Amino acid sequence: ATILLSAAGAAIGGGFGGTVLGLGRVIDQRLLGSGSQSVETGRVDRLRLSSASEGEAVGRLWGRMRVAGQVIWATRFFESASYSLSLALALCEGEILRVGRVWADGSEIEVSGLNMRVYRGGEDQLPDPKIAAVEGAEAAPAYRGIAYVVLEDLQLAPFGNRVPQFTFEVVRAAQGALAEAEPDLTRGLRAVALIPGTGWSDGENYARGHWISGRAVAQPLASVVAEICGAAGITEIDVSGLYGLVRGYTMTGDQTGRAGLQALMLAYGFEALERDGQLVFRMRDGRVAADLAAADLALGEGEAVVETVRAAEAEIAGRVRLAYVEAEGDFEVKAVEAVFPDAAAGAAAGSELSLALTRAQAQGIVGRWLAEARVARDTARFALPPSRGHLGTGDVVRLDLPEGKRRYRIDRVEQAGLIQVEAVRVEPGIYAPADEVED
Amino acid sequence: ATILLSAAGAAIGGGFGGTVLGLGRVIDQRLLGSGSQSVETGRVDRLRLSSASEGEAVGRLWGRMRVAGQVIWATRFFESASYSLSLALALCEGEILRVGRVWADGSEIEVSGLNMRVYRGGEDQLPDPKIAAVEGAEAAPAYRGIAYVVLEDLQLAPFGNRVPQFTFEVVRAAQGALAEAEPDLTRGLRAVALIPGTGWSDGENYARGHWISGRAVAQPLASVVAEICGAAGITEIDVSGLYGLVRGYTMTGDQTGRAGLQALMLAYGFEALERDGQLVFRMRDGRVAADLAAADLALGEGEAVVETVRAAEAEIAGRVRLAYVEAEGDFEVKAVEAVFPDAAAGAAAGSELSLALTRAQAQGIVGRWLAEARVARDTARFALPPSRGHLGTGDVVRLDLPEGKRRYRIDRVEQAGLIQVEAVRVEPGIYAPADEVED
Amino acid sequence: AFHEVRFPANLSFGSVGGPERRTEIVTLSSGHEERNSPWAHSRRHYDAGVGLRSLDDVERLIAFFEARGGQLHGFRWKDWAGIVSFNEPPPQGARVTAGFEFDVPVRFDTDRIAVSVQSFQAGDLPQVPVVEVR
Amino acid sequence: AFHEVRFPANLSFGSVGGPERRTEIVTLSSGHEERNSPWAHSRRHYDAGVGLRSLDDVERLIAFFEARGGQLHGFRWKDWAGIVSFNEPPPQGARVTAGFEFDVPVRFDTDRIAVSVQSFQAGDLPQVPVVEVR
Amino acid sequence: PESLKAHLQGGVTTLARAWALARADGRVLGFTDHDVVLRFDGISFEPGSGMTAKAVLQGTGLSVDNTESYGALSSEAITEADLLAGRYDGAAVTVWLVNWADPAMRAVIFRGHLGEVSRGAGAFTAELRGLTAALGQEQGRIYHPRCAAVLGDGRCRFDLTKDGYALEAALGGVDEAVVLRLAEGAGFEDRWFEKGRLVVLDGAAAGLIGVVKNDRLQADGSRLIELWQRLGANPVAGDRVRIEPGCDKRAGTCRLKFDNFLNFRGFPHIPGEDWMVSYPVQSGTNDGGSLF
Amino acid sequence: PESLKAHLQGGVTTLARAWALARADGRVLGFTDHDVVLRFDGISFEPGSGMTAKAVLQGTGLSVDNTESYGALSSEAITEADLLAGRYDGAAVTVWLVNWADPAMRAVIFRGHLGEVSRGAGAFTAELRGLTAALGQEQGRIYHPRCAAVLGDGRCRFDLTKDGYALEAALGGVDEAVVLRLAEGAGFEDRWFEKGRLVVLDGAAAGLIGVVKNDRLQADGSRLIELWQRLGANPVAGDRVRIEPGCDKRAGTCRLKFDNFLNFRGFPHIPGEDWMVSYPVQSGTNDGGSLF
Amino acid sequence: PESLKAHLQGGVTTLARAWALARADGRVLGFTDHDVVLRFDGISFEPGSGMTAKAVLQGTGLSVDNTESYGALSSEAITEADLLAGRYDGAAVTVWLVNWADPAMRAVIFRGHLGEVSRGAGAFTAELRGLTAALGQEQGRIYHPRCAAVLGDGRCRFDLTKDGYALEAALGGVDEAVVLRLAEGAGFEDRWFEKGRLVVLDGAAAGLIGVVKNDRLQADGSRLIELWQRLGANPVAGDRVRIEPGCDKRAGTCRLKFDNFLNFRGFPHIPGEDWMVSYPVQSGTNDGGSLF
Ligand code: SF4
Ligand code: SF4
C-alpha cells in the first residue's frame, strides 16, 4: 500500500536528526561566519547568589573573577547570647591562588574580621581543616579537587541574622599539560621583587607603567584554551599561534565544553582551524596565503566560477552590544555599544560574554565587531582545484577579479577531490587595536 | 513565471508543520529509543514558593509529596498589639487524605500551634468553612474540586511580620474509574490495626519489616497512569501489566498530560505499547516473543535484510544523573550519579524527575540507565513479513544471526502490508533490582 | 574463486570489452584541467557474450552460471583479443597476468541470465557482462 | 602529457568533433540577453573515432588506451579537418598551436573502452571522444 | 492478528482490509477493500467509498499513529455537506483486517480518532490520529475569578430541566443561521440565556450545538437570538431547538439566577501578587475584613 | 599536502587515497584505494576492504568533520563479530592521501575518531567524526553526596593490586555471558565486589570490560556473579578474568572497606535548600553540632 | 490593479511586468519584461537587464514578501563594481504591472526593499524583501554609560559645520584605500577625529561613507588616517573628502571637545546591581556624596 504524508515525518525524524549529531545569538553567528552553528553561550550571571542545593554544578574559572560558591557542611546555628556558624563555601576546582576581598550580601566585609581558612583544592589532597572535627576525623570529608573556603565562628549579626549570600574574588592559574610546560608569570616569574615604593596619587601612568600589580594574575590565552581541550581530553591540541590575556573567564559546569570556548572565539576572534589532526588554534589575521586569480578557480557545482552573496541591508547589525564584567573595580555587569554613524536606524545585535575585561577594551571589541559584521556581509562560494589543496580550511584567499581584488577567508571546505569553498569577506585592518582612552 | 527559493520556504511551513501535528533531554531520548520524540519533562521545582497571582495553574500529585499551594482569600492584617491573618492555601485537586507536617519559610512549625482546618476538596461539595463568614454566607466560595487549607488567627510574629512561604506535605490517593475498581491499601486495607508497640532504637530492619507505617500512602503505579488517561479522557486504558509504587509524583497544571506520564516511562521503563485500541501499558522486560532466524526477515526498502546501526562512542552517556526528591526526610532535591569505570572521561547526561523516591532506589535507577543507554546503542532496521504480523509494536525479537543472536525490542512499525521495523538492542538483565544498601 | 574452465567455446561476433579507469577529473573551468588516477591497473570489463548452439549445449551453459558460478567464483575467461608489457610507446604497459596466457579471471555482471529458444534446437542468450575481479 | 604518436592511421567516416564554448548565458525572460565567455580559445572536442583493421592492429590499440594512455596523457591527435589565424571575417581566429601542424593534444572521454570482434580478424570499437586538454 | 496465524503463515492468504467509523451521531459508516459488500458486525461495509489504506505507522512513544485513508465522497457516503457542517469531528474508527472468505478471521490494527480530514477534487483524505491523541494536550484550571465548569458538568450539577429554565420552542425565522427569530420568544426574562446550548434536534441540523449571544426580545416576545458561529447546516424554519439557560460564570450571576452557588468550582477572592510581597504597614485599616 | 605540490601542480597526478585506523586494542587496520597493497609505515594497507572515501567536509567552527567511508567487512577485515561486541568504538583513524608511485609523498587530511558505524547488507558505513568530537559534551561534577571518581582515577588513586583485593581466577561456567560461575569463588567476602571491572584478558573476549553485580557465593566458594550487560563476545569457560573490587562510592563504604578515605572527591554533608532560606529560630537546638 | 479590470477581465490581455529601483544615490534604474524600452514616469525602463520576476508571495502576517528577480549585470546596468562597493544596499523598488499598449493602465504589486542580492556566473539574483523588513529587528537603548546617538541625530543636534570642526580638504595618497595621506593634514588637533564620517563626494567613490581611526599627523601636518573598513571603491588621489569630528561618546570627551553636553542622551552614573541588594551598613562613609 502507498505511503502517507509522514513522508514529511520520516524526512525530519530521523531524516534530519542525523545532521546535528554530526555537527543573544543575533551577533554570534555572523562573527563565526558561515562557519558552523553557534551554540548558545554565556548568559552572563548578574546577582551572583549561592544556592545550597545538590544539583548545582562545579564551576570553573581562569583568573581574577568573582564566583558565588555554595554551601557544603554548615553546622547548626550557635547562640552566644547573636548567632554563629561554621560554613564551608566551595568556589571552584583545581589548584588556585589565594582568595582575597570577600564581600557578602551587600557592599564589603573585611577579611581580617573573618576567621576563614582558604584551601587550594590541591590534587596533593589537603587534609581535613580540623574545624570539621565538629563532625570528627572519622567522617571528615577531605576534598581533593574542589577549592573550598571554610568560615569559622561567623557572627551573623551585621547582615540580619540569616545567612548572607557570599561572593568571593578568586584567582586561579591555568593548569593542564600544556600549561605546566611554557610557564607564564604565575609560576614563570620565579621571584620579581623590585617593589617601586617611594610613597590622591599618580596612577595616570598605571596602564603604561612597568610594574605588574594586578595584571600579574591574568593568564595567557594560549593555556586557557589548552585547559579546555585538556579537560575535554584532546591532548593533540596545537596552540602556539595564540596571543591574548584572559583576565578572569568563567564558565560553569555542564557548559558543553565548546560553548565555553566559543565566547573566546568572539572576543579574540581566533580560528580554531584544524588543518591536520593537531587542531591548530591560530589567531585570525588578514595574512593572505593563496593569491588566486579569477582564471584559477575550478568548475563548481552550480557552474559559476564565483557565486558572490551580499547579505541584506535590513540585517547588518547597525549597533552591537556587550555584557562584559568590570574586571578592575567591584566586578559588575556592564555594557558598551558601538554605533555606525550612517545607519544607526536599527538592527541592534548584542551578545553577552561572561569574561572580565577593562573599559577601553570592551569598546575596542564592540568597535571591532561592528566593523567586522559589516565586512562579513559578502560571502563567496567558489570551487578551487586540488592542484592547490594546501589551502587549509581557515586560510584567506586574495582572489583577484576583474573588478575588485577583495580578500576572502574560507569556511566549509567540502572536497571529495574537488575543493569547494564557502568563503567570507575578511579585511586585514579589522584586527588592530582601536587605541581608545580608559576609565 | 518561475518559483523562487521559497521552495525552501514552502518546504518548511507548512511542509514540515504537518509532521509534529501528527506526532535535560540528553538522556531522555535514548531511554525511549528511536521510539518517539521525548517531550520536555519535569524541570524539578526547588525552593517551592507560593505565588498569590491569578495565572498559576492547579497542581496535581499522587502520594506523599510537598506542594507549595497558593493564597486564596486572605483577610486584611489584624493588629492585636503583633499581627494576624486568615489565610486559605489551596494545595491540589481531588479528594485527598489529611495534610500533616506543615513547615513555612524556614525549618518547621508545629501544626498543633496552628488553627488550620484542612479540607479534602470533595466532589461531595464540602460547605463553607465558616471562617469565611468574614465575607458572609452569601458570598462564601465553597470550593468543590480543589483541596484548600484555611489558617485561622495566624500570628505573623515568629517569621518576621510578612507572610511566609508555606509548604505542605500532602497525601493524595490515586482516583479515577480504574482506581475505584481494584482498591489498593488506601481504601483496600479496610482496617489493619496490629500496632507493634512494645517500646536510639531498632530501625535497621524497617526497610524489611512487616509493618506498614509511611509506605501505606504510596499508590500503585497501575492506577496513577490510569488517572492520567482518565483525566485526559481515555477510558479505554489497559493497565494490568504494571507493577510499581509511585510514592509522591507531582506534575503541575498544563503539563501536556503526556509529559507528566513520560517521567514515569524513564523511572519504571514501561512500554506504553498500544497493540490494539486498548493502549496496553506493560512493564518492559526481556521476555522474547518472536524468535526470528536470519532467513525469516522480509525484503526491506534499502534492500538489506538487517541494517544494524551502532551509535557513536563520543555520545554514549558515560555518566548519568538524576534530580529526584528525598521522599523520606525533609523533601529536598537530591542527586545521585552512576559512572561507568572504563569510560568516565566524559559524556555526562542527566535528567530531572519530579517524583519522590528513596536513596537506594535513585542509585538503582541511574545504575539502570547507564547500563541501558550503553546497551541501546545498537539499533536494527529490518523488515519482517506480514506472515507473522502478531509482532506488536512493543515486542522484542530474538533475531538469530550467523554471528551473535542479540535480542532486539522494536519501535516505529510502519507496515502497509510489509512490516518494516526500527528495532533497538535490549538485554533481559537490565531490568533487575540493583540490590544496594540504603540511607 | 575457481580455476575451473575457460568457457563454452562458442562466442558470437560482437563480444565487446575493454579496460576501465576511474580517473576522476575536475575540469578547471577557466583553463586546462588536472586529473588523478588511483588504479595503476585496469579492469578489462568484457561484455556481450552470446552462446549459440544446440539445446545440448544449453544445459551445460545454464548451470555454468549456476554450479561453479553461483555469483562469487572465477571461471577464467578466454580473450579473442608472468607479466605482459606493451612496448609500442616509449611508455610501458607492464600489466600483470595472475592467470596464464590471456585468461583474465572474471565474474558475470548479472543477477539473472536469460536464455531464449529460437527454434526446435536453437539456444540463445544475448549478454553476459564481466569485469574481471582480482 | 606526452609527445608519443599521432594515432593508428585508420579512422572511420563519421569521426565528428568541433569547438566547444563555455558560453555562460543569462536568458532574460523579457527578451534579448547578454553573454560572455572566459576562454578566449575553444576546446576542439573531437569524438567518434573508430579503429577498423585486423586483430594485429587491435593489441597495439587496446594498450594505446592503456600503456601511454591511462587517462591523463597527451597522445597528440590527428585532424582530418606556430599560430594559425582565420581571416575570412574582418575578425580573426588567432588560435595557437602548441603542437606542430594540426596535432592538437587530447585525451579520451571514457572510463573504459569497448572493442568488439566482428569476424575472425575484424576489430572494431565504436567511439573515442576527446576534448584536447591543454 | 488473533488466531488467524494458521491462515496467515501460509503464503496463500486473502486478507482484505476494511474499516468502520462511528460518527458523533449514532450512525456508523462502512468501508472495505474487498470490492464486494461484506459485514461481520451489523455495519454493512461498503466498498463504494473510502479505503486506500496507506501505511499505518506505530510507536512505543506517546506520539499518535497515523493513516491518511484516501477515499471518495458520495451521497450514500460522507457527502461533505455533512462533513463541513461540523460532523465527523471526534469520529471514532476501528480498522480491521478481515478475511473476506471468512469474516470471523479478523483483528484490529488500531482504534483511531480521525483528526485531520482534507477533502478536495471530489475526494477526501482523512488523517487517522492514533489512540493517544488526548495525551499531548493541556488540561487544567488556573485559579481565575470566574467559574470553570459547564452547566451539565459533574463539578457543577444543576438538573437543567428542573423548572421552566429551558426554552423548548420550535423555530421560525432562521434567516442567515445566526439570527433566529423564534415564534415563542415569550416565557422568560429579557437576556435570560446569553451563554447557552442551542441544541437543534430536528431537520437538517440534527443534534447540532451552537452557542447563543444577544438574547433580545423586540416585540410581543419575539426573542431574536444571535449566535457566535454558524450552525453549518441551515435550519428550515420549522425545526425544534432547545436552549439551556446562560451562565455568566460569576458569583453574583451564579447565586441570583441559579440556586447552585454551593457547586461553584471557582476562585472569587484570590488576593494578588502585590498582597504577597507586601509587608504590613501599621497605618490605616489593619482590622479583619473582606479585603474587598 | 606537504611538499608534494611539485607533484600536484602538474595535471599529471596520481594520488590514491588510503587510511589506517587504530582500534582500542593495539592492532591497526589498513585500507587503500590504490587496488594494490602498499605501505609506508608498518601498517600494510589492504585494498581488500574499506575505501569509498566520500566527501570529507570542514569548518572553522567547533563542529566535527565527517566522512562516511563505505567499505566491506570480511574475515581479514573488521568481520563485524568484532565490531558488534564492543570494539572499534573509540577507534582513531588518520586518513592519508599517498602517492602510490612514491609513498613518501603524503599528508593527512584529518585525524578522526569514527563515531557512527552503520553496517548492513554485507557492508559497513562508518561516519568519521572529526577531531573536535570531545568538545560539545558536558563534563562536570554536581556536588552530589556520593563519590565522583573511578578506582584507577587520579582524583582517587588506590594501588588496586596492593593486597588480596583483585580476584585473578580463571573462569568456568560462562552460561549466557551474564552469569559466570567461577571455579575459584573462595578467597573473599560475600558481596565483596559489586561495582568492579570484569576485565577478561584471554580467549574470545580479549581485553573486554564489563561491570559486575550480584556477587553471591552459593556453595563452597562458587561466587556466581551477574553483570549489567553482555560482554558481546562469549567467554569459553577457560578464559582468565580479573575483577577489581567494588566501590559503593559512599563515605561509610569508602573508609571501612578501603583505606583511602582521604582521596574522597565527594561531597557528603551539603546542607540543602531549606537550610539556605531558613532564618534562625531561637527555639530548640541552637548549639554547634553535626546538623546530622 | 487599479481600474484596468476592463482590460483584465477580457481573456485578451497584454500586461507586461516592469519595475524601477531607486538606489541610495539619487539615480534610479529601469527594468521591464516588455522587450521594448518603455516609460510612463521619467524612468526609461530598459529590457536590457533584470526581469525574470519569479513568484511574488504575500502574507497577512508581519513576515516580508519576496521575489528573487533574476537578471543580468552590464555596463549600462548595475555592473557589480557598483554593487560590491556598497551601493544598492537599502535600494527601494516598486514593481509595476504595466500594460505595454497603454502604460497608464498600471498598478504596484508591492514596494520592496531588495535585501539579499546574490550575483554570480555573469548574472545577479536579488531577493526583494517586503514592505515589513524593518519590523522584526531590535531597536532600543540599554542604559549604558556612554552616549547613544550619532552626531547628526535629533537626540544630539550639533550644527556640525558651526566652526572649523570639519576637515574639507581634498585627498592625496590613497594607497590601499585604508591609509589616506591627505595633503592638508594641518589645521586641527592631533587625534581630533577618531570616530567620524569620511564622506567622499567626488570621483569613483561618490557619496560613500567610511569611519576613521588612527588620526595621526606624522610630519608637517600630514594627518595619516586609517579606516575600519575599505571604501570598496578606490579613491583616485584627487577626490574631495570631508571628515566630521570624532565623538568618543563619553561625558568627559563630550563637554570638553564639544559644547553640547546638554543633549547627552546617555546614562553616566547607573549605580549597579551590588548597590541594589545592599542594605545600609552604619559604618564608614554614610553621608551624601557622588558615590563616585
Ligand atoms: S454559575 Fe453556577 S451553574 Fe453556572 S457555570 Fe458557574 S457554578 Fe456552574
Ligand atoms: S569509595 Fe574511595 S576508592 Fe571508591 S570511588 Fe569513592 S573515593 Fe574512590
Ligand code: SF4
Ligand atoms: S559626545 Fe555629545 S555630540 Fe558626541 S554622540 Fe555623545 S551626545 Fe552626541
